[PDB]
Structures are given as structure tokens and as C-alpha cells.
């Protein structure tokens, strides 16, 4: 059934609303955490705890 | 606000006569010696006393009084005579009462003498008993007139009784020596047949009469429903009467006072009443926002009895989350303005839940943190700052 005939295949698509909500949420949380840590490290900083 | 302030410190005296008020640490002869809280409560009491004058003398006559004052002022405002006529633009108390007496023929001098010249609010303590033999309702209304902020009321008093035959108003004459007021009660033939019980408005509803007493027809009682005096009422109903007044009343102040009085009865019927109020659109939204906090207090008081999940969580996932994912919140669409306010007030009350160890449960804290993480506001036409601020709260 493979000697002479060929048909194409595709990659597995993830159309699930749960995992898409999870992916967009975690990527937004991670990029805003990275942005706020970068901006707090390269400027004047405060701290709730002593030398934190 | 005013009964809290007047019972806290002395009282607000509209129209003093020149000290007239010596119970308070400043002089009321000039506006610049008044405390700022006294100035705020002065304006507040002034507009409530004007609502009382509208209650005695109807609203169209009141607007005619105001139009007569404005018309005298605007005929005065065009003259050139240096104040021969420019003082008709200045109102006084005697001129205001005279214009009221001109347009209506009634004078309000007892109402002015009680609520303006006298500086106090009244306190009502009511309790009822139903006489089954003579079919009467014996009310017992006593006043606390020896507190520092209080005064004694001797006028008439409206009371609204909802019985099975409908809603009936009664006027009671509360003289100084009065204590027991016997009002008559109607039939109970709407429990013989299942018929709908007619409400305060023209409509009628189906009520579950299993919680009601078998011998009494009366479903709830409200002392002074229209707020026609400056009063603080402390009525002693039964808990099922407070639940019926929360569910089937067509007055928002009675639903609010039944929410306020259901915190003393933590029975599961009251939890069912507040949960049915919370699920109910076509209830006024500020009643449901109060029922959130009342349900939180009741849930804290009946720990080691609570069966299922924490309070309002399943209701939040039923109202505001996705059907396929219960722990993922729906993307923000704030275009309804009543489920927006309820959505932003429900986790704030849900966070007041406490376990048997007095610590907030990790099921509600995790729920609030998932409400924070899965928040998506790229799709509504409104901002998210108040909802996120309430999430921090």
C-alpha cells in the first residue's frame, strides 16, 4: 500500500479552549513578571523586607 | 448616616435660635466654627426633612412652593432699586413656611417643631404577638427616649402587614402612655386553596407556605415602611418572616433590612433565601451585593455544618465562568453593568470565608488567584481597573 502511491500529512493541531486559555495566561504572566523584574533591577528599587 | 451620627454625638439642630446646642464641643452660631462632619450631616438632615415636608404636603405643591420662591426672586432680580426689592431674593424660614401655607392651606408647624427645632431622632423597639382567638395582631412598640441623641415621638405611625390575603396598611397613634396596639387580621383562605398571595404592588406570586405557622395568616410586618420619620427600627420578627420579606417583597429597603436581620439567624433556610436572592436577576443589584456579605457571615457561623463547597463558589462558576471549564473565568465583557458589579463584589465577600482553624480556605484563595491569572480584558469596551482593584481587595 506504499510502493507507488503518496498522500500528505500535517502536524497535530491543538484546538482546545482550556489549553489555549492556559497558554495565553501563562505567557502573559511570564512576560509581565520578566518585564517588572528587569525594570526593578535596572532602576531605583524599594523592598517590603530588609535588603530584599 | 444621620441616626448613626445623632446617636453618636448629641444631634444636628436645623434652625437654631440665638447656646441652643450645648451638647457638642463647638458653637453653631457661624458656619466657620462648625465641624466638617457636622456640616455634612447638616446638609443630609436638611434634605431628609424636606422629604418629610413633601410627605405631609404632596410633591406637586412642593414644586409649586419652589416655583413661587424662584418667581419672586426673578421678578426681584430685574429691578434696579437698591434692595427695595432685591431682598425678595433672600429666603427665610418664616417666608418659606408662609409660602407653603399659601399654596397648600395646611401649615407644617408640628412637623417643623418636631424635626427642625428639636434636634433628635427616634428609636423604635417593636415586637408582635398574634391572638388566634380574636384574630388580632397585638403590636408592642416602645421607644428609647433616654439615650443622649433621642427624642419622643407622639404622632401617627404607619405599619404595613403582609398577610395571606394581601398587604394592608394601618395607622397607629403612638401617644406617650401607649404600648399595645391591636390591629385586625384577615382570613387564611389562601392556604386552604393554593391561590397566589397578592403583594404590595398589583402583582401576586406563588409562595412556599411550609415554613409559615399554621395558626397565623401574617407573613411579615414592617414598622414605618415609607421612612416617614427620622427613625431607627428594631423589630423582632421570626426568621421565616425575614426570609419571606427577603424573597417576595417589592421594596428594596425591606429586602436590605431583611438581609441585615438574617445575620442573626444562621439556619439553612436563610442560606437558601440569600442564595435565591443572589441567583435572581430582576432583583435590584445592590441587594444582591449585600446578600454576598450576608452569605459570607452566615457561612462563617455554620462551619462544621456546611455540606458542599464554600459559599458562592459554585454560584460564581455557574454565573461568570465557562460551561466547559469551571475554573477558567469567562473573558471580560462588562456591558451589563449589574453582573459586572456582582462579579466584582462576589470574591471580595467570598474571601471572608474561614475554616474551623480560623484560616481562609485554600480553595477560595486558589479560586481568587485563578480569577487573577485568567483575566483577559482585550475584548470589552470598558476598562478593568476597578475589577482588578477589587481582586486585590
Swiss-Prot record, chain A:
Disulfide bridge partners, by residue number: none
Induction per the UniProt record: Induced with triglyceride accumulation.
Highest taxon of source: Eukaryota
Location of the protein in the cell: Nucleus; Cytoplasm
Comment block on domains: Ectopic expression of the histone fold domain acts as a dominant-negative mutant resulting in differentiation inhibition.
Other known facts: 'Taube nuss' means 'empty nut' in German.
Role, per record: The TFIID basal transcription factor complex plays a major role in the initiation of RNA polymerase II (Pol II)-dependent transcription. TFIID recognizes and binds promoters with or without a TATA box via its subunit TBP, a TATA-box-binding protein, and promotes assembly of the pre-initiation complex (PIC). The TFIID complex consists of TBP and TBP-associated factors (TAFs), including TAF1, TAF2, TAF3, TAF4, TAF5, TAF6, TAF7, TAF8, TAF9, TAF10, TAF11, TAF12 and TAF13. The TFIID complex structure can be divided into 3 modules TFIID-A, TFIID-B, and TFIID-C.
Subunit structure: Component of the TFIID basal transcription factor complex, composed of TATA-box-binding protein TBP, and a number of TBP-associated factors (TAFs), including TAF1, TAF2, TAF3, TAF4, TAF5, TAF6, TAF7, TAF8, TAF9, TAF10, TAF11, TAF12 and TAF13. Interacts with TBP, TAF1, TAF6, TAF10, TAF11 and TAF13. Component also of a small TAF complex (SMAT) containing TAF8, TAF10 and SUPT7L. Forms a heterodimer with TAF10. Interaction with TAF10 is mediated mainly via its histone fold domain while interaction with SUPT7L is via its C-terminal region.
Medical condition linked: Neurodevelopmental disorder with severe motor impairment, absent language, cerebral hypomyelination, and brain atrophy: An autosomal recessive disorder with onset soon after birth or in early infancy. Affected individuals do not show developmental progress, are unable to sit or walk, do not acquire speech, have poor visual fixation, and show poor overall growth associated with feeding problems. Additional variable features include seizures, spasticity, and joint contractures. Brain imaging shows hypomyelination, thin corpus callosum, and cerebral and cerebellar atrophy.
Family: Belongs to the TAF8 family.
Protein name: Transcription initiation factor TFIID subunit 8
Organism of provenance: Homo sapiens
Section of the entire sequence shown: 156 to 207 of 310
Curated annotation (Swiss-Prot), chain B:
One function term, GO molecular function aspect: RNA polymerase II general transcription initiation factor activity
Bridged cysteine pairs (disulfide): none
Result, substituting residue 16 to H: In NEDFCF; uncertain significance
Entry keywords, A to Z: Disease variant, Intellectual disability, Nucleus, Phosphoprotein, Transcription, Transcription regulation
Keyword Transcription regulation assigned: yes
Compartment(s) where it occurs, according to its Swiss-Prot or TrEMBL record: Nucleus
Presence of keyword Transcription regulation: yes
Tissue specificity: Expressed in all tissues tested.
GO cellular component terms, semicolon-separated: nucleoplasm; nucleus; transcription factor TFIID complex; transcription factor TFTC complex
GO biological process: G2/M transition of mitotic cell cycle; mRNA transcription by RNA polymerase II; positive regulation of DNA-templated transcription; positive regulation of transcription initiation by RNA polymerase II; regulation of DNA repair; regulation of transcription by RNA polymerase II; RNA polymerase II preinitiation complex assembly; transcription initiation at RNA polymerase II promoter
Spans traversing the lipid bilayer: none
Misc. remarks from the entry: PubMed:9418870 was unable to show an association between TAF2 and TFIID.
Disease: Neurodevelopmental disorder with feeding difficulties, thin corpus callosum, and foot deformity: An autosomal recessive disorder characterized by impaired intellectual development, microcephaly, delayed psychomotor development, pyramidal signs, thin corpus callosum, and foot deformity.
Subunit structure, as described in the record: Component of the TFIID basal transcription factor complex, composed of TATA-box-binding protein TBP, and a number of TBP-associated factors (TAFs), including TAF1, TAF2, TAF3, TAF4, TAF5, TAF6, TAF7, TAF8, TAF9, TAF10, TAF11, TAF12 and TAF13. Interacts with TAF2C1. Component of the TFTC-HAT complex.
Protein family: Belongs to the TAF2 family.
UniProt-recorded name of the protein: Transcription initiation factor TFIID subunit 2
Naturally occurring in which organism (per UniProt): Homo sapiens (Human)
Interval of the full protein contained in this chain: 401 to 800 of 1199
Amino acid at each position: 500500500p506504499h510502493t507507488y502511491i503518496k498522500t500528505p500529512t500535517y502536524r497535530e493541531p491543538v484546538s482546545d479552549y482550556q489549553v489555549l486559555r492556559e497558554k495565553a495566561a501563562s505567557q502573559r504572566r511570564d512576560v509581565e513578571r520578566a518585564l517588572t523584574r528587569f525594570m526593578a533591577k535596572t532602576g531605583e528599587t524599594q523592598s517590603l523586607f530588609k535588603d530584599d | 448616616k444621620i441616626v448613626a451620627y445623632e446617636l453618636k454625638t448629641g444631634g444636628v439642630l436645623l434652625h437654631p435660635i440665638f447656646n441652643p446646642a450645648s451638647h457638642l464641643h463647638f458653637s453653631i452660631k457661624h458656619p466657620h466654627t462648625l465641624s466638617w462632619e457636622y456640616y455634612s450631616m447638616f446638609q443630609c438632615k436638611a434634605h431628609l426633612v424636606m422629604r418629610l415636608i413633601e410627605n405631609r404636603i404632596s410633591m406637586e405643591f412642593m414644586l409649586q412652593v419652589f416655583n413661587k420662591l424662584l418667581s419672586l426672586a426673578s421678578t426681584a432680580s430685574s429691578q434696579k432699586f437698591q434692595s427695595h426689592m432685591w431682598s425678595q431674593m433672600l429666603v427665610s424660614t418664616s417666608g418659606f413656611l408662609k409660602s407653603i401655607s399659601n399654596v397648600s392651606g395646611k401649615d407644617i408647624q408640628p412637623l417643623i417643631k418636631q424635626w427642625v427645632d428639636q434636634s433628635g431622632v427616634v428609636k423604635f423597639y417593636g415586637s408582635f404577638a398574634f391572638n388566634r382567638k380574636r384574630n388580632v395582631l397585638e403590636l408592642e412598640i416602645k421607644q428609647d427616649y433616654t439615650s443622649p441623641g433621642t427624642q419622643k415621638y407622639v404622632g401617627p405611625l404607619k405599619v404595613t402587614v403582609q398577610e395571606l390575603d394581601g398587604s394592608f396598611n394601618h395607622t397607629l397613634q403612638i401617644e406617650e402612655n401607649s404600648l399595645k396596639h391591636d390591629i385586625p387580621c384577615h382570613s387564611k383562605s389562601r392556604r386552604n386553596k393554593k391561590k397566589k398571595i397578592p403583594l404590595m404592588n398589583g402583582e401576586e406570586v406563588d409562595m412556599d407556605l411550609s415554613a409559615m405557622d399554621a395558626d397565623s395568616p401574617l407573613l411579615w410586618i414592617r414598622i414605618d415602611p415609607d421612612m416617614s420619620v427620622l427613625r431607627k427600627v428594631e423589630f423582632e420578627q421570626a426568621d421565616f418572616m425575614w426570609q419571606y420579606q427577603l424573597r417576595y417583597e417589592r421594596d428594596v429597603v425591606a429586602q436590605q433590612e431583611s438581609i441585615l436581620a438574617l445575620e442573626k439567624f444562621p439556619t439553612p433556610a436563610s442560606r437558601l433565601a440569600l442564595t435565591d436572592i443572589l441567583e435572581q436577576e430582576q432583583c435590584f443589584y445592590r441587594v444582591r451585593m449585600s446578600a454576598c456579605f450576608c452569605l459570607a457571615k452566615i457561612a462563617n457561623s455554620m462551619v462544621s455544618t456546611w455540606t458542599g463547597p464554600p459559599a458562592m463558589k459554585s454560584l460564581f462558576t455557574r454565573m461568570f465562568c465557562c460551561k466547559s471549564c469551571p475554573n477558567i473565568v469567562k473573558t471580560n465583557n462588562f456591558m451589563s453593568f449589574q453582573s459586572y458589579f456582582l462579579q466584582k463584589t462576589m470574591p471580595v465577600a467570598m474571601a471572608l470565608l474561614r475554616d474551623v482553624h480560623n484560616l481562609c480556605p485554600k480553595e477560595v484563595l486558589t479560586f481568587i488567584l485563578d480569577l487573577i491569572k485568567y483575566n483577559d480584558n482585550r475584548k470589552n469596551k470598558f476598562s478593568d481597573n476597578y475589577y482588578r482593584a477589587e481582586m486585590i481587595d
